[PDB]
DNA sequence: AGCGTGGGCGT
DNA sequence: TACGCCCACGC
């Protein structure tokens, strides 16, 4: 089962790993340790900060295998690729 | 479309 | 524990 439960009285979510609960607590504490150097916006997660910066830089590492169109995030590419399916 | 952001991991 | 993938869900 999931032994790590959120100690917040209003929350009843559970987790299987320690660090996942630790990350979840930041939702309640509102902790946002990672800041964008460009627009000074704060983020709760380092990886989400990385993808956010691409909105400023215009970096798009992920290209569609079918047409070559580039995207800032991998899930953006995945959502796109399926449109080449014409049933 | 553009993108915030939590969840579920693997390392 | 932190780091950073994929993956979802949502607007
Ligand atoms: Zn909670
Ligand atoms: Zn920014
Ligand atoms: Zn394409």
Domain of A73: which CATH number? 3.30.160.60
Q: Is the separation of the CB atoms in A58 and A70 below 8 Å?
A: no
- The two structure tokens encoding residue A69: 């169109």
Q: Which of A23, A25, A50 is nearest to A35 (CA)?
A: A50
Domain hosting residue A68, numbered range: 1-87
- Name the experimental technique: X-ray
* Cα A53 to Cα A65: distance, rounded to the nearest angstrom: 24
What is the number of domains present in chain A? 1
Residue A50, CA distances (Å) to A9, A18, A22, A36, A71 in order: 33, 24, 20, 9, 14
| Ligand 1: centre distance to CA A27 (Å) | 7
- The two structure tokens encoding residue A24: 């979840």
A16 touches strand C (CB under 7 A): no
Element of type H or E holding A71? strand A70-71
**Residue for token digits 């080449």?**
A84
The separation between the first and the last C-alpha atoms of chain A, rounded to the nearest angstrom, is 42
- The two structure tokens encoding residue A41: 């916006």
- The two structure tokens encoding residue A80: 């796109």
Q: Is the separation of the CB atoms in A78 and A63 below 8 Å?
A: no
* Cβ count near A35 (within 10 Å): 12
* Cα A63 to Cα A11: distance, rounded to the nearest angstrom: 40
- The C1' atom of B6 and the CA atom of A18 lie apart, in whole Å, by 16
Q: Which residues contact A51 (CB under 8 A, 6 or more apart)?
A: A72, A73
**Residue for token digits 């509102």?**
A30
């Amino acid at each position: 089962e999931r032994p790590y439960a959120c100690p917040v009285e209003s929350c009843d979510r559970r987790f299987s790993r320690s660090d996942e609960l630790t990350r979840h607590i930041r939702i309640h504490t509102g902790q946002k340790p990672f800041q964008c150097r460009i627009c000074m916006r704060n983020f709760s997660r380092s990886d989400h900060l990385t993808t956010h910066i691409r909105t400023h830089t215009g970096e798009k590492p992920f290209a569609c295998d079918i047409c070559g169109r580039k995207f800032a995030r991998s899930d953006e590419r995945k959502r796109h690729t399926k449109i080449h399916l014409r049933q």
